[PDB]
Each structure stands twice: as C-alpha cells, then as structure tokens.
C-alpha cells in the first residue's frame, strides 16, 4: 500500500463536478475547486486547472494528473512548514503517509493547528495522540476516514486499509 492507494480509498474518484462532504465543489480524487457557491465559479476554476473547456467533466487521465500535483504539493508543503517538517522527519514511513493524508484533506494550516497531537506524535506517544486527534471537528464530521488515519498513526501499519 502506498500514499496514492491510500488517498484513492479515502477520497474516491469522480469525473463530474461534485460536492464534497462540506458542500464544496470538487472533482477527481478530492481536488477542491472552489469554496464558492457558484457552480459557475467551479466550472471556471476547473477549466483553468485543466487548460481546456471541460464543461464540468474530466477524463481519468486528467483526474490522475491533478492527483499527482496535489500529493506533490502536500509533501512539499509539509517539508517547507516549520511546524510540520520536524514531525514528518521524526516519523516512520507509514506514519509519514498518515500525515500526508491529513494535509491533503485539511491543508497545512489546518494540520499545523493540531498543536498537541503533533507534539505527541513527535514524542512517539501513539495511544495518547490517537485519543487527542479524535477530539476534533475533523473526527466528528468524517469519522470513518478520521478513524482509518488515526489507526494508521496508532499502529504504524496499514491495517485500517487492508480491509477496503
């Protein structure tokens, strides 16, 4: 299992504009288009993103291209971030994917806000960190996905996804 397969499980793949869990316009594999309520603002953003007139629909290939870009941006973001980097450097390979997962979903800023959890992860206090992470809006809004991620942090294995 790898970061791509992990995220493909958690986000799914949709070739037509859709609304995410939060009500925002998304496409492909969790690619947020706009927070704007306008489907038209979404369609414009999408064409800008693809470089073609898409009329709200993209191919598998386009979806994957965006996916490659997003994962890449998530990793570089972590490595450039003063709060995130030290955490990432301290982790094993599997746990590293768990952090990339959070960043892809909630942005750098969002994850960097999890001060206490970050501290516990750095300290390798797995159980403690899992419990802290669960006390969040993140967990309340998307419990099954949050649990899969939390489990990955807790155990350092791909068990939560071996099912799926």
Annotated ligand binding at 104? The verdict is yes
- For the chain, the distance separating the N- and C-terminal CA atoms, rounded to the nearest angstrom, is 11
Q: Which technique was the structure solved with, according to the deposited record? A: X-ray
Annotated ligand binding at 117? The verdict is yes
Map out the domains of the chain with their CATH numbers.
1-164 (1.10.530.40)
Structure resolution in Å? 1.7
Query: Which residues belong to the active site?
Result: 11, 20
Annotated ligand binding at 32? The verdict is yes
């Amino acid at each position: 299992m790898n970061i791509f397969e992990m995220l493909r499980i958690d986000e799914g793949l949709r070739l037509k504009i859709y609304k995410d869990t939060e009500g925002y316009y998304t496409i492909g594999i969790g690619h947020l288009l706009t927070k704007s309520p306008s489907l038209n603002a979404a369609k414009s953003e999408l064409d800008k993103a693809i470089g073609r007139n898409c009329n709200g629909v993209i191919t598998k290939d386009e979806a994957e291209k965006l996916f490659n870009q997003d994962v890449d941006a998530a990793v570089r973001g972590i490595l450039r971030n003063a709060k995130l980097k030290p955490v990432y450097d301290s982790l094993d390979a599997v746990r590293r994917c768990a952090l990339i997962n959070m960043v892809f979903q909630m942005g750098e800023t969002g994850v960097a806000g999890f001060t206490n959890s970050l501290r516990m992860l750095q300290q390798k206090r797995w159980d403690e960190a899992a419990v802290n992470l669960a006390e969040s809006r993140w967990y309340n809004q998307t419990p099954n996905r949050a649990k899969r991620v939390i489990t990955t942090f807790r155990t350092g294995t791909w068990d939560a996804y071996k099912n799926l």
